[PDB]
Design a protein around this ligand. Structure first.
Ligand SMILES: *[C@@H]1O[C@H](CO)[C@@H](O)[C@H](O)[C@H]1NC(C)=O
Length: 33
């Protein structure tokens, strides 16, 4: 779903997440993408 400033990333060991590039917070909460 994602609050303001959260956008998609991935861990090289194989896991997708969403990262707040305004604070550096990281969570698995997924939007349409
Ligand atoms: C990959 O490493 C990250 C950071 O420790 C962790 O959050 C993620 O769950 C890991 N995924 C796998 C499949 O190893």
């Amino acid at each position: 779903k994602l609050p303001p400033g959260w956008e998609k990333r991935m861990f090289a060991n194989g896991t997708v997440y969403y990262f707040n590039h305004i604070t550096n917070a990281s969570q698995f909460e997924r939007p349409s993408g």
